[PDB]
Structure formats: structure tokens, C-alpha cells
Amino acid sequence: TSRQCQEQLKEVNKTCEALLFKLGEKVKTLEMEVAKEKAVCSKDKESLLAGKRQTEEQLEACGKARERQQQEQQVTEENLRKVQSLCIP
Amino acid sequence: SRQCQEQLKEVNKTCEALLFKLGEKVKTLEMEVAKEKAVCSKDKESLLAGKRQTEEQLEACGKARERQQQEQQVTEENLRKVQSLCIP
């Protein structure tokens, strides 16, 4: 075993070994990111759906109010025509 | 530098083979992150657009029930005015 063979054996895996540690850190970082994105997505979707449900309920109520205001108008209009036709016999 | 080079070769080959196996894990996870972010943002955009259209419908319905009330006031005012000219 030469002294230059020994120096080479000491150095051969250094960058490979240092990369192994860095890849462990990257795996952990990516596993946390997957878990976080999945949790934030579902939370955001729930808020959007809740906001949308509230607007749909308001649209339903407005629509029903619109049907009963067009109902009353038809009655008032006929009463007005009746009074105008029978006015001054 | 005789059997030393064959030693340097086998030790690095073992280390490099482990690095590439672990590297398959990183690549798999990067693709999963990219896929989920694309599906999530696309779905969020559709939900927000759908919400924006229902609000516009609620705004239009509200403006239509404002026109109906104003026209009901017009009919009631005409009825009140014509009643003063006609016997009940």
C-alpha cells in the first residue's frame, strides 16, 4: 500500500458521502411539502365551498322572493285595470 | 497503484449505487409535488370562477327585485290616483 494509494482511498467517496447526507435532508423536505400541500389544499377548498354555498342559498331566497313579487304585481295590475274600466259608468 | 485502482473502483461503485437508489426517491417526490400543485391550483381556479358566477347571478337577481318593487310602487301610486276619480 503506497502513501499516495492511501491518500486516494481517504478521498474517493468524500463527495458521494456528503451527497448522501444532503439527499436525506431533501427527502425529508419533500415529504413535509407533500403533507403540507395536501392539508392546505383541502382547507382552501373547504373555505371556497362554504363561501359558494352561502351565495347559492342567497340566490335561492332572492329567486323565490322574485316569484312572489311578480305574483303581487299581476294582482295589483288587474285591480288597476278593473278600477279604470269601471270608472265613470 | 496496482490492485489499489481496483479497490478505489469497487468502493466508489458501492457508494454511487446507493446515491442513485436514494436519488430515485427525490425524483419520485418532486414529480408528486408538481402533480399535486397542478391539480390543486386548477381545481381552486374552477371553484373561484364558479363562486364568481353565482355572485354575479345574485347581483342580477337583486337588481331585478329592485325593478319589480319600483314597478309595484308605480302601480300602487296609479291605483291611489285613479281611486280619487272613481266611485268604490
Whole-number count of domains of chain A: 1
* Largest interface (CB < 8 Å): A-B, 50 and 47 residues
What proportion strand of chain A?
under 5%
Strand count, sense and closure of the main sheet of chain A? none
Alpha-carbon distance between the termini of chain A? Answer: 133 Å
Q: What series of H and E elements makes up the topology of chain A?
A: HH
> Helical amount among residues of chain A, as a percent range?
over 70%
Please state the oligomeric state of the protein chains shown: homodimer
Total beta-strand segments of chain A: 0
Assign the structural class of chain A, choosing from mainly alpha, mainly beta, alpha/beta, alpha+beta, or little secondary structure: mainly alpha
How many separate helices of chain A? 2
Write the layout of secondary structure elements.
2 copies of one chain form a homodimer.
Chain A: H1 3-11, H2 14-86
Protein name (chain B): Plasmalemma vesicle-associated protein
Glycosylation sites (chain B): 12
Subcellular location (chain B): Cell membrane; Membrane, Caveola; Cytoplasm, Perinuclear region
Explain how this protein is built:
The structure is a homodimer. Chain A has two helices and no strands. With 89 residues, chain A is mainly alpha-helical. Chain A has one domain. The longest helix of chain A is centred in the middle third of the chain and has 73 residues, at 14-86. The termini of chain A are far apart.
